[PDB]
C-alpha cells in the first residue's frame, strides 16, 4: 500500500485550490494605496516590506514603486535595513 | 487527397494604438468582463461573429474564436469600434493572424504505434499524458494531433496555406498506417 | 410571509439604529417618526483606420438606463460558463418581480447566450 | 496621523508646483477632501508634534519652506 | 461604507424617501440619514442571511452580461423562475450580484 | 579541490566564547550544490520504490545533461529530477507510470509530464513506447497473484 | 444648553470611572490605553473597507 | 559483554533519532508554507538502512 | 534486538510536535496549526529482494552470497498524525505500515 500511485498529492491540491480561489493581488489606484499606507504608518513608526505587502494587499513591484516615491529605506540596528513610511 | 481541413479557431492580434481604462470599458461595455485578480485584461464576447476578444490597457487586443480570416478581421474591427464608441481613440493597426486551428477526418483508424515508430524524430505518443499523438512537422511549422479514430487537428499555422500544406504532407504518411 | 419577514426586519433595523441615535445625541422620537413614515410610504479598404465602414453594429443601450423591468439583487458563490451557457449559484438575496418581492436562499440558474 | 503624512506629501507636491506660498491647514484639508472638526484638532495636536520635528519644514506663520538648500 | 445592495429596491427606496422627508423637515441631519442607511444595510444583510431557508430555481436565456469590481450585471430574457411550490414567468430580468 | 576542518583537540580550538573551527567551512558553487541536492532527491525518490542503483545512475547522468543544457532552467529542480527518473526507467526497460513517479515525488503528474516532454526535446533522444507487458510483473507481484495468473494477464493484454 | 454641558461633564466622570474602576481589574489579573490601541487598528480596515463602498456605488 | 543485539540497538537508537530529526525539518518547511505535508514523503528511508 | 529493542526504541522517542511560525500575521490566537506525530507498532517483513522490474520477491541467502546482495528485511511503522488547527476539531489520521 505504501507510496500508492496518485495523480497529485492531496495537500498540494488543497493548497492550489486555496491559491486559485484567492487569486493574485490586484493593482489598486495610487490614491487608495497611499491612504492605506498612511493609516498603517499611523499604527506605529516602523514596518517591514513583507508585512506591509500583507497589509496593503498590492503587488510587490507596484507597492515598492509607490513606497520609493515617498518612503525611504533606513539601515538600522533593529535587524536590517527596512522601509520608513514617513516621507521625510 | 480529396480532404481539406476546416478551420475551427483563429487567433489574431491587433494594436489599437492608444492606452485604455479597463475599469471604464468594463463598466460601459455590453458583454465585457474585468477581473483584475483573475486576469489582467478585459474579456468581451460578440455573438454575431461568435468570437471572444481580450483587451489590455496597453491598447493591444487579441481576438479568438473566429472560423475564418475575414470573420476574425471583422470581429476585431467590431471590438475596436465598440471601444471607440466608448470614447477612446481606438484604431486598427498591425492586425495580424497569430495562430490558426483546423480540424479534419481521414475516415479510417490509424495505428499510432507504427506511426511513432516510423517517425520518432517528429512524433510523440504518450497515452498516459494524452491519448492523441503529437506530430511536429518541420517544413511547415505545424503541430498535428492525430487520433486513433482518424480525427486530425492542426495548429500553429499563420495562414490557411500552412494548414492545407501540412495536411497534404501528413495524409500519405497516415495512409501508410491505415488500420 | 414576506410581510412578516419585513416586520422582523423593521425590528432589527430599529434595534440596530438605537445605539447610533444615542451616539449622535439625537432624541429617540426620530425613530418613531421614521418608522411611521416608512410604513406609510411602503403601504479593398487598404487604409483601415476609419471604423465608420460598419454601422448599426450595436443594440439599444436604453435597457440599462431604464431598469424599470424586474430586478434581482443577490450574492454569487459560483458562476461557471462553458462556451454557450451561463450557470449560476446565487446565494441568499432578494428579487423584485412584478412589484411583488421574493426571498430565497439558494438560487440555481442556467441561461444561453 | 497617516492622513497627516499624506498632507506632508501634498505640500511636497506643492513645492513641486513652485507656487509655494504661506498657507494654513484648513485650505489644504479642503483641497485634499477632508473635513474641519475636532478630528482636525487632534490631528493638529499631532501636527504640532510634527512642528517639533518638521524636517519637512512646517512653521506656524509664514512657512513650508522645506529645502535646507533652496534657490532657483 | 458597506455592501450597499438593497438600497436600490422597494425597501431601500422607501427608507430613503422617508429620510428625505425628515431632512426636508429638518428633523434629522444628513449624517444621521446616512448612518441609518448603513445600519439598515447591516441589518438587512444579516436578516436575509439568517431567516431565509428556502431553495429556488430558474431558467431562461441571457442577452447581456457585465463584470467589474466583483459585480455581475447579467441581463436575461424570457426567464421562468421555477419553485417547488410555485412557478413565475417573466419576460426580462436583470440580475445584479456581488461578493 | 577542497578540504574541511574538524574540532581537533580541546585547547585553543575553541576561543573566547567557543569559536569552534575559527569558522564554518563554507565550500562550493551553486552550479554544483543544486546538482548535489538533485542527486540526493533522486536517490530518495528511487529508494521510495526500491529502484536499483543503475537506474539511479542513469537518472543522475540525464539530470546532468539536462541541467548543463539549461533549457529547463525555469522549471523547478524536483520536477526535472522526477522526469529524469521516469525517462531512466523507460530507457532501462522497466517503465513506471507517471502516477507511480508522482507517488514518490512532491511534483504533480502534470508538471512531471511537461518536464518529461521538455527533457526529451532538449536531449534530442526518444523512449520506446510502453506496452502492456511492461507493467504486468510489478502489478501482479504487488497484487500477490500467482505466476500462472500473471502469465494469463500478460497474454490477455498482448 | 448649560444643562447639556453639565451632562457632558458627567459623561467625562463616567468614562474616567469606567477606565480606572478596572485599569484595576487588569492589574488584579491601562484600559484606556488598550482602547486607544484598538481604535488605532480599525482605521486601516475601515478605509480599505470604505472606498470599496465608493466604487460599488459607481458600479451599481 | 556487548553482543550483536545491544550494539545494533545503539546504532538503531542513533539512526531513528536522525530519522525523526529529518522528518521534523522537512515537515516544518511545508508547515511554514501552509501545505499539509505527506508523512510518507517526509520519511527518508535510506537513513536506517 | 528485533523483537523488543526496535519497538522500544520507537516508543521511547518523544512525539514530534510541529507548529507554524505565526503564519499569515493575523490575530494569531494559536492560529498556526499544531501537527503531532507518534510512531507505533513496528512491523518487520521477511527478507525481500526487489528486482529491476520492481517486483518484490523473497531473497534466499545463497542468492545474496552469489549476487552480492545484502540480506535485509523491510521495516514498517504505524504512524498517527493529529492536526490541531484551533478550529475546535482535531483529526487523527493513521498511516499503517509506513
CATH classification of the domain holding B159: 3.30.310.10
Q: Do B37 and A27 touch (CB under 8 A)?
A: no
Return d(Cα B178, Cα B115) in angstroms, integer: 10
Nearest-Cα distance to chain F for H47, in Å, is: 10
Write a three-state SS string for chain C. CHHHHHHHHHHHHHHHHHHHHHHCCCCCHHHHHHHHHHHHHHCCCCCCCCCCCCCCCCCCCHHHHHCCCEEEEEEEEEEEEECCEEEEEEEEEEEECCCCEEEECEEEEEEEC
Q: Do G46 and E1 touch (CB under 8 A)?
A: yes
Q: Where among B56, B82, B97 does a domain terminate? A: B97
Nearest to B78 by CA among B93, B58, B63, B67: B63
B88 lies in the same domain as B108: no
Return d(Cα B136, Cα B114) in angstroms, integer: 16
A70 reaches D (C-beta below 8 A): yes
E69 reaches B (C-beta below 8 A): yes
C-alpha B22: how far from its chain's center? 25
Strand-pair category, B6-15 with E55-64: unpaired
Nearest-Cα distance to chain H for I82, in Å, is: 11
Return d(Cα E60, Cα H16) in angstroms, integer: 65
Residues E10, C96 contacting (CB under 8 angstroms): yes
Q: How far is CA C96 from CA C75, E27, E49, E90, E96, in A?
A: 15, 31, 18, 11, 12
For residue B108, give the 3-state DSSP assignment. coil
Return d(Cα E94, Cα C95) in angstroms, integer: 10
* Identity of the residue in G40, G44, G51 whose CB atom sits nearest the CB atom of A55: G44
Q: Do A7 and F99 touch (CB under 8 A)?
A: yes
Nearest-Å Rg of the Cα atoms of chain B is: 20
Give the dihedral sign, CA E28/E3/A32/G60: negative
Strand-pair category, C101-104 with C85-96: antiparallel
Annotated ligand binding at B15? The verdict is no
Q: Regarding the domain with residue range E1-53, which homologous superfamily does it belong to in the CATH classification?
A: Transcription factor IIA gamma subunit, alpha-helical domain (1.10.287.190)
Chain D residues lying within 8 Å of A70, measured CB to CB: 9
**CA neighbours within 13 Å on the CB side: how many for C89?**
6
Q: Do F98 and B125 touch (CB under 8 A)?
A: no
For residue I56, give the 3-state DSSP assignment. strand
Q: Do I81 and H28 touch (CB under 8 A)?
A: no
Chain A residues lying within 8 Å of G48, measured CB to CB: 36, 57
Task: Name the phi and psi angles at F128, rounded to 5.
Answer: -60, 145
Question: How many Cβ pairs closer than 8 A exist between chain A and H?
Answer: 18
**Residue D6 corresponds to which cell in the numbers above?**
499624506
DSSP string, B40-54: SSEEEEETTTTEEEE
Give the dihedral sign, CA B76/B81/B86/B91: positive
B150 lies in the same domain as B84: no
Q: Exposed (0-12), middle (13-18) or buried (19+): which is H34, by Cβ within 10 Å?
A: middle
Nearest-Å Rg of the Cα atoms of chain G is: 19
**CA neighbours within 13 Å on the CB side: how many for I61?**
0
Q: Do G50 and E1 touch (CB under 8 A)?
A: yes
Q: Do F55 and I52 touch (CB under 8 A)?
A: yes
Residues C80, C88 contacting (CB under 8 angstroms): no
Q: Do D1 and A37 touch (CB under 8 A)?
A: no
Q: Can you name the residues that pair with C101 across neighbouring β-strands? A: C96
Residue A8 domain-assigned (yes or no):
no
Nearest-Cα distance to chain A for B34, in Å, is: 12
Return d(Cα B141, Cα B156) in angstroms, integer: 7
Q: Do E96 and C108 touch (CB under 8 A)?
A: no
Task: Name the phi and psi angles at I59, rounded to 5.
Answer: -110, 110
Closest CA in chain C for residue E38: C17
Q: Do A41 and D12 touch (CB under 8 A)?
A: no
Q: What is the dihedral of CA A28, A30, A34, A35, to 10 degrees?
A: -70
Return d(Cα F27, Cα F2) in angstroms, integer: 7
Closest CA in chain F for residue I56: F141
* Identity of the residue in A2, A51, A54 whose CB atom sits nearest the CB atom of I97: A2
Residues A27, B36 contacting (CB under 8 angstroms): yes
Nearest-Cα distance to chain A for B173, in Å, is: 35
Q: How many helices (H) and strands (E) does chain F have?
A: 7, 0
Return d(Cα B138, Cα B116) in angstroms, integer: 16
Chain G residues lying within 8 Å of E6, measured CB to CB: none
Residue A2 domain-assigned (yes or no):
no
Residue with cell 480529396: B2
A85 reaches D (C-beta below 8 A): yes
Nearest to F89 by CA among F129, F51, F61: F51
Task: Name the phi and psi angles at F114, rounded to 5.
Answer: -65, -45
Tell me how crowded residue F34 is: count the other CB atoms within 10 A of its CB: 12
E69 reaches G (C-beta below 8 A): yes
* Identity of the residue in C54, C59, C113 whose CB atom sits nearest the CB atom of B81: C54
Structure determination technique employed: cryo-EM
Return d(Cα H44, Cα H15) in angstroms, integer: 11
Q: Which chains border F (3 or more CB–CB pairs < 8 Å)?
A: A, B, H, I
**Residue C28 corresponds to which cell in the numbers above?**
429617540
Give the dihedral sign, CA I17/I23/I29/I33: negative
- Substitution target in G42, G46, G48, G51 with the highest count of A β-carbons within 10 Å is G48
CATH code of the domain containing A48: 1.10.10.10
D21 reaches A (C-beta below 8 A): no
B60 lies in the same domain as B127: no
Q: Does chain D touch chain I (at least 3 C-beta pairs within 8 Å)?
A: no
Q: Do A11 and H30 touch (CB under 8 A)?
A: yes
B171 lies in the same domain as B152: yes
Residues 6 or more apart whose CB falls under 8 angstroms from that of B47 comprise: C113
B64 lies in the same domain as B103: no
Q: How far is CA C73 from CA C98, E34, E66, G41, in A?
A: 15, 21, 14, 33
B81 lies in the same domain as B18: yes
Nearest-Cα distance to chain A for H26, in Å, is: 14
Return d(Cα F132, Cα F119) in angstroms, integer: 24
Return d(Cα F34, Cα F21) in angstroms, integer: 26
Chain A residues lying within 8 Å of H39, measured CB to CB: none
Q: Does chain I touch chain B (at least 3 C-beta pairs within 8 Å)?
A: no
Q: Which run of H or E residues covers position E71?
A: strand E71-82
B4 reaches F (C-beta below 8 A): no
Q: Do H40 and A3 touch (CB under 8 A)?
A: yes
Q: Do B38 and A25 touch (CB under 8 A)?
A: no
Question: How many Cβ pairs closer than 8 A exist between chain B and F?
Answer: 20
- Substitution target in F41, F48, F53 with the highest count of H β-carbons within 10 Å is F48
Nearest-Cα distance to chain B for F39, in Å, is: 26
Q: How far is CA B77 from CA B47, B89, D26, in A?
A: 14, 13, 52
Give the dihedral sign, CA I36/I37/I38/I41: positive
Closest CA in chain B for residue C48: B92
- Substitution target in B122, B124, B126, B138 with the highest count of F β-carbons within 10 Å is B126
Return d(Cα A77, Cα F34) in angstroms, integer: 33
Nearest-Cα distance to chain F for I6, in Å, is: 21
B138 lies in the same domain as B89: no
Return d(Cα F43, Cα F59) in angstroms, integer: 9
For chain A, the domain total comes to 1
Q: Do G47 and A35 touch (CB under 8 A)?
A: yes
**CA neighbours within 13 Å on the CB side: how many for C95?**
22
CATH code of the domain containing F38: 1.10.472.10
B73 lies in the same domain as B104: no
Residue A7 domain-assigned (yes or no):
no
B77: containing domain: 12-97
Annotated ligand binding at F33? The verdict is no
* Identity of the residue in I16, I20, I83 whose CB atom sits nearest the CB atom of H32: I20
Task: Name the phi and psi angles at B41, rounded to 5.
Answer: -110, 180
* Identity of the residue in E64, E68, E70 whose CB atom sits nearest the CB atom of B31: E64
Report how far apart the first and last C-alpha atoms of chain F are (Å, whole number): 54
H33 reaches F (C-beta below 8 A): no
Nearest to H30 by CA among I20, F104, F39, A24: I20
Q: Which chains border C (3 or more CB–CB pairs < 8 Å)?
A: B, E
Residues B117, B173 contacting (CB under 8 angstroms): no
Residues G54, E69 contacting (CB under 8 angstroms): no
Q: Do H48 and I18 touch (CB under 8 A)?
A: no
Q: How many residues does chain F have?
A: 158
A69: containing domain: 22-84
Q: Where are the domains of chain E?
A: 1-53, 54-99
* Identity of the residue in B116, B125, B128 whose CB atom sits nearest the CB atom of F98: B128
- What is the architecture of the domain spanning E54-99? Roll (2.30)
Q: Which chains border G (3 or more CB–CB pairs < 8 Å)?
A: A, E
From the candidate CATH numbers 2.40.50.320, 1.10.230.10, 2.40.50.140, 1.10.287.100, the one assigned to the domain spanning C1-43 = 1.10.287.100
Residue E6 DSSP class:
G
Return d(Cα B169, Cα B146) in angstroms, integer: 13
Q: Where are the domains of chain D?
A: 1-72
Annotated ligand binding at B45? The verdict is yes
Amino acid at each position: 500500500t505504501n507510496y500508492k500511485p496518485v495523480a497529485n498529492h492531496q495537500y498540494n491540491i488543497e493548497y492550489e485550490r486555496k491559491k486559485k480561489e484567492d487569486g493574485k493581488r490586484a493593482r489598486a489606484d495610487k490614491q487608495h494605496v497611499l491612504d492605506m499606507l498612511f493609516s498603517a504608518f499611523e499604527k506605529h513608526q516602523y514596518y517591514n516590506l513583507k508585512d506591509l505587502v500583507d497589509i496593503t494587499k498590492q503587488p510587490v513591484v507596484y507597492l515598492k514603486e509607490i513606497l520609493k516615491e515617498i518612503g525611504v529605506q533606513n539601515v538600522k540596528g533593529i535587524h536590517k535595513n527596512t522601509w520608513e513610511l514617513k516621507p521625510e | 487527397s480529396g480532404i481539406v481541413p476546416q478551420l475551427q479557431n483563429i487567433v489574431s492580434t491587433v494594436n489599437l494604438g492608444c492606452k485604455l481604462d479597463l475599469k471604464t470599458i468594463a463598466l460601459r461595455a455590453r458583454n465585457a468582463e474585468y477581473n483584475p485578480k483573475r486576469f489582467a485584461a478585459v474579456i468581451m464576447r460578440i455573438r454575431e461573429p461568435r468570437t471572444t476578444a481580450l483587451i489590455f490597457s496597453s491598447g493591444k487586443m487579441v481576438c479568438t474564436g473566429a472560423k475564418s480570416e475575414e470573420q476574425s478581421r471583422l470581429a476585431a474591427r467590431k471590438y475596436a469600434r465598440v471601444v471607440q464608441k466608448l470614447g477612446f481613440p481606438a484604431k486598427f493597426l498591425d492586425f495580424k493572424i497569430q495562430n490558426m486551428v483546423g480540424s479534419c477526418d481521414v475516415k479510417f483508424p490509424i495505428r499510432l504505434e507504427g506511426l511513432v515508430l516510423t517517425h520518432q524524430q517528429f512524433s510523440s505518443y504518450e497515452p498516459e499524458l494524452f491519448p492523441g499523438l503529437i506530430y511536429r512537422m518541420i517544413k511547415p511549422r505545424i503541430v498535428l494531433l492525430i487520433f486513433v479514430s482518424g480525427k486530425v487537428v492542426l495548429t500553429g499555422a499563420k495562414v490557411r496555406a500552412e494548414i492545407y500544406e501540412a495536411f497534404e504532407n501528413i495524409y500519405p504518411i497516415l495512409k501508410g498506417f491505415r488500420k | 410571509t414576506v410581510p412578516k419577514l419585513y416586520r422582523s426586519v423593521i425590528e432589527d433595523v430599529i434595534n440596530d439604529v438605537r445605539d447610533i441615535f444615542l451616539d449622535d445625541g439625537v432624541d429617540e422620537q426620530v425613530l418613531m417618526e421614521l418608522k411611521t413614515l416608512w410604513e406609510n410610504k411602503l403601504m479593398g479598404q487598404v487604409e483601415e483606420e476609419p471604423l465608420n465602414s460598419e454601422d448599426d453594429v450595436s443594440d439599444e443601450e436604453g435597457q440599462e438606463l431604464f431598469d424599470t423591468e424586474n430586478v434581482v439583487v443577490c450574492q454569487y458563490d459560483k458562476i461557471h460558463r462553458s462556451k454557450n451557457k451561463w450557470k449560476f449559484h446565487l446565494k441568499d438575496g432578494i428579487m423584485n418581480l412584478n412589484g411583488r418581492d421574493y426571498i430565497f436562499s439558494k438560487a440555481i440558474g442556467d441561461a444561453e447566450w | 496621523f497617516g492622513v497627516l503624512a499624506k498632507i506632508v506629501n501634498y505640500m511636497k507636491t506643492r513645492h513641486q508646483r513652485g507656487d509655494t506660498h504661506p498657507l494654513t491647514l484648513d485650505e489644504i484639508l479642503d483641497e485634499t477632501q477632508h473635513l474641519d472638526i475636532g478630528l482636525k484638532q487632534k490631528q493638529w495636536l499631532m501636527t504640532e508634534a510634527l512642528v517639533n520635528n518638521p524636517k519637512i519644514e512646517v512653521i506656524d506663520g509664514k512657512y513650508a519652506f522645506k529645502p535646507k538648500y533652496n534657490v532657483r | 461604507m458597506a455592501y450597499q445592495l438593497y438600497r436600490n429596491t422597494t425597501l431601500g427606496n422607501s427608507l430613503q424617501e422617508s429620510l428625505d422627508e425628515l431632512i426636508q423637515s429638518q428633523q434629522i441631519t444628513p449624517q444621521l440619514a446616512l448612518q441609518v442607511l448603513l445600519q439598515f444595510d447591516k441589518a438587512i444583510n444579516a436578516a436575509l442571511a439568517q431567516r431565509v431557508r428556502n431553495r429556488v430555481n430558474f431558467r431562461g436565456s441571457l442577452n447581456t452580461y457585465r463584470f467589474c469590481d466583483n459585480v455581475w450585471t447579467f441581463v436575461l430574457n424570457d426567464v421562468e423562475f421555477r419553485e417547488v411550490t410555485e412557478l413565475i414567468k417573466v419576460d426580462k430580468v436583470k440580475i445584479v450580484a456581488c461578493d | 579541490l577542497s578540504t574541511m576542518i574538524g574540532k581537533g583537540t580541546g585547547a585553543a580550538s575553541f576561543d573566547e566564547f567557543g569559536n569552534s573551527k575559527y569558522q564554518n567551512r563554507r565550500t562550493m558553487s551553486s552550479s554544483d550544490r543544486a546538482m548535489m541536492n538533485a542527486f540526493k532527491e533522486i536517490t530518495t525518490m528511487a529508494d521510495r520504490i526500491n529502484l536499483p542503483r543503475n537506474i539511479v545512475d542513469r537518472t543522475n547522468n540525464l539530470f546532468k545533461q539536462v541541467y548543463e543544457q539549461k533549457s529547463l532552467k525555469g522549471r523547478a529542480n524536483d520536477a526535472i529530477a522526477s522526469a529524469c527518473l521516469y525517462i531512466a526507467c523507460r530507457q532501462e526497460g522497466v517503465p513506471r507510470t507517471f502516477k507511480e513517479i508522482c507517488a514518490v515525488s512532491r511534483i504533480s503528474k502534470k508538471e512531471i509530464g511537461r518536464c518529461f516532454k521538455l527533457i526529451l526535446k532538449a536531449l534530442e533522444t526518444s523512449v520506446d513506447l510502453i506496452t502492456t507487458g511492461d507493467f504486468m510483473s510489478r502489478f501482479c507481484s504487488n497484487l500477490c497473484l500467482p505466476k500462472q495468473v500473471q502469465m494469463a494477464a500478460t497474454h490477455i493484454a498482448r | 444648553a448649560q444643562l447639556k454641558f453639565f451632562e457632558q461633564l458627567d459623561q467625562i466622570e463616567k468614562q474616567r470611572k469606567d477606565e480606572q474602576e478596572r485599569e484595576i481589574l487588569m492589574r488584579a489579573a491601562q484600559l484606556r490605553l488598550k482602547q486607544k490601541a484598538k481604535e488605532m487598528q480599525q482605521q486601516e480596515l475601515a478605509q480599505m473597507r470604505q472606498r470599496d463602498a465608493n466604487l460599488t456605488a459607481l458600479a451599481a | 559483554l556487548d553482543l550483536a543485539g545491544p550494539l545494533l540497538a545503539f546504532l538503531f537508537r542513533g539512526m531513528f533519532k536522525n530519522l525523526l530529526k529529518e522528518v521534523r525539518i522537512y515537515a516544518q518547511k511545508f508547515i511554514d508554507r501552509g501545505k499539509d505535508f505527506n508523512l510518507e514523503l517526509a520519511i527518508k528511508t535510506r537513513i536506517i538502512s | 534486538f528485533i523483537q523488543m529493542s526496535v519497538q522500544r526504541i520507537v516508543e521511547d522517542a518523544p512525539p514530534i510536535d510541529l507548529q507554524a511560525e505565526a503564519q499569515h500575521a493575523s490575530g494569531e490566537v494559536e492560529e498556526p496549526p499544531r501537527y503531532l506525530l507518534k510512531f507505533e507498532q513496528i512491523y518487520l517483513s521477511k527478507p525481500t529482494h526487489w528486482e529491476r522490474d520492481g517486483a518484490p520477491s523473497p531473497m534466499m541467502p545463497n542468492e545474496a552470497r552469489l549476487r552480492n546482495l545484502t540480506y535485509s528485511a523491510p521495516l514498517y511503522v504505524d504512524i498517527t498524525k493529529t492536526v490541531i488547527k484551533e478550529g475546535e476539531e482535531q483529526l487523527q489520521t493513521q498511516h499503517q505500515k509506513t
